[PDB]
C-alpha cells in the first residue's frame, strides 16, 4: 500500500536501478510487479516478483536483461536493467497486489490493485 | 523360465515403471507450468499443486471401492488408465498456446489434473493387488520378491524421471515460447505405453472376479453391529467376544470374518499417518541443512537440491541388498522377522536417521569455517532413512496383501495409501507451524518417531494375524 517509485534519466547502453518503496502495511503480504507506459502506448508488463521473492518473471523484452528483487524489511523493491536501448523510454509504474487465491495472470494489470507513480527513465 | 514367477508380472512391473516415470515427469514441471505459462500466483500455484497431490493420494478410496465391489481388477485398472490417458490428453492439449488463452488453458489444465488424479488413485492399489493375485496363495515367498521388484520399479521410474525431465524442458520452442506441450506429452505417451503393455498381457493374467458389493456389505455389517449393541434399558447379550459377533442375525460368518480382519488391520495402521508425516520431513529440512555445508566434494560441485536424488538411488541398492542378502542372513539363524518386526525396526531406523540429522545439525552449528561439514556426513542419515523406507514400505505392501481377505485384497492397499494420504495432510497442516531451531526440530522428529514406533510395536504385539 502506498508504493512510491524513484528513478532517473540514463544514457543509451547503460544500466539503471529503479526503486519501489512500500509504506503503510507489511511488504511480505504483497505480490509486486513493474509496468511501463511509453508515451502513446497503453502499458507494458516489465517484471514481477512474488511476496517471498522466490518466484520472479520478466516480460519477453526485459530490454537486454532485468533483475527484480525485493527486501521485505523496509519494503524496498528494485529493478536492475542493464542494456537499455532507445526504446523503453517510458514511465515505470510499481504495482502491488496482496496475497490471495486467484486465476488472474500475474503479468497483467488486472491482477494488481495498487499502483505507484511513474518515473521518466529516458534514453 | 519354469520358475514360480508367472510371466504376467513382467507386464505389470514394466507397466508400473512406465506409470511412475510418466507421473513424476508430469508432476515435476507442474509448478513451473502454473507460474511461467499460466502466470498464476505463488500462492495459487502452490495451493493447486498441493490440492492435486492430495486428490491423487485420496482417490485410492474410489479406485479400491470400484475394484472390490464392481468390475473387479483389470477392468478398474483398464478404465482408470483410460481416464488417466484422457487427463494427460487434456493436460498436454491445455498447454499449447495456439488455441484459446487464460480461459481454455486453465479449464483444460484443471480438468486434466482432476482426471490424472482419478486415474492415479485406482491404478495405484489395483495394480499392486493384481500383481499379488497373479501368485498362488502358497507362493508367499515369491510374492514378497515380486513386491520388492514392484517397489524397485517405482523408485527406478522416479529416478529416471528426475534424470530425464530437465532434458525435455530445456531450450525448446513449442510455439515462440517455452515448450510445455512436450513436458506433458512425453508423460502422456509413457502412460499410453504403460496401458498398452498392461493390456497386452490380458491372455496371461489371472483375473479373479469380485465377490459382490464388498464395500456396501461391509458398511451395512458395521452399521448393524454398532446399532445392535444399543441395549440401553434392557439386553443381556448385545455382542459378546467381539463387537461383530452378534451382528450375525444377518451377514453370515464368511462376511463377519472379513470385516473383522479389515478392522484389525485398520486399527494396526491407525498410527501410520504420523510416521509418514515425520518421515516426509526429509525432502525439505535436509535440503536446508545441506545448504549450510560444503558441496564441492573435491571432484564435482554438488548442489544441495541434487542430494534428494540420493533417496531413490540408495533404495535401488538396498532393495536387492536386503531381500537377497541381509534378510537371508537374518534367516540363516533362528531369528524370525515376521513382517511386523521389519516395520518396527524400519521405524527405529528412521528415528536413528533423524537423530543423526540432529547431531549433524549440531556439528554444523558448532562452527567457530574450519569445521565446515562437507555435503558428505549427510550420507549416514540418508542411508538410515532409505533403509527404514525399504524395510517399511515393501513389508507394508506385502502385509496389506497377505493379511487382506480375498474379497478385499485391493481395499487394504487403499488403506495403506490412505495412511500415506493422511500423513500428507498432517504434513500440510503442520507446515504452517515453524518456531523451533533446526537441531531441536530434528531431535523432536526423532523423539516423535520413537514414540510412534513404540505405539505401533505395542499394537502389533496384540495383532491377530489373518488365518
Ligand atoms: C504409498 C507410497 C507411495 C505412493 O503413494 O505411490 N510410494 C511412492 O511414490 C514411493 N516413494 C519412494 O519410493 C520414495 N523413495 C519415498 C520418498 C519419501 C518418502 O517419505 C517415502 C518414499 C512409495 S512411498 C509410499
Numbering used by the authors:
A (entry chain B): 3 to 125
B (entry chain A): 38 to 405, 602 to 700
List sentences from the manuscript.
The proton-coupled peptide transporters PepT1 (SLC15A1) and PepT2 (SLC15A2) have been extensively studied due to their influence on the oral bioavailability and renal clearance of beta-lactam antibiotics in the body. The primary physiological role of the SLC15 family is the absorption and retention of dietary nitrogen in the form of di- and tripeptides. POT family transporters belong to the Major Facilitator Superfamily (MFS). They are all proton (H+) driven symporters, using the inwardly direct proton electrochemical gradient (ΔμH+) to drive the concentrative uptake of peptides and drugs into the cell. Here, we present cryo-EM structures of the proton-coupled peptide transporter, PepT2 from Rattus norvegicus, in complex with the widely used beta-lactam antibiotics cefadroxil, amoxicillin and cloxacillin.
To gain further insight into the mechanism of antibiotic recognition, we determined the structure of PepT2 in complex with both cefadroxil and amoxicillin at 3.1 Å and 3.2 Å, respectively, using cryo-EM. In both structures, the transporter adopts an outward open, extracellular facing state, with a large solvent-accessible cavity extending from the exterior of the transporter down towards the intracellular gate, which is constructed from the packing together of TMs 4–5 and TMs 10–11. Cefadroxil can be clearly observed in the map and adopts an elongated ‘L-shaped’ conformation. The carbonyl group of cefadroxil also interacts with Asn192, anchoring this region of the drug within the transporter. The remainder of the drug molecule makes fewer direct interactions with the binding site; the carbonyl group in the beta-lactam ring hydrogen bonds to Tyr61 on the extracellular gating helix, TM1, while the methyl group at the C3 position on the dihydrothiazine ring sits within a hydrophobic pocket, observed previously in bacterial homologues of the POT family, and formed by Leu650, Val653 and Trp649 on the intracellular gating helix TM11. The carboxyl group sits within the positively charged pocket formed by Arg57 on TM1 and Lys161 on TM4, effectively clamping the drug within the binding site between two opposing electrostatic charges. A plausible explanation for the increased affinity comes from the cryo-EM structure of cefadroxil, which reveals the hydroxyl is positioned close to a key gating helix, TM7 and interacts directly with Asp317. The difference in affinity between the two antibiotics can be rationalized from the structural comparison, with cefadroxil adopting a very similar pose to the di-peptide. Of note is the interaction made between the cefadroxil carbonyl and Asn192, which helps to orientate the first side chain of peptides towards the binding site entrance, facilitating optimal interactions between the amino terminus, Asn348 and Glu622 to enable transport.
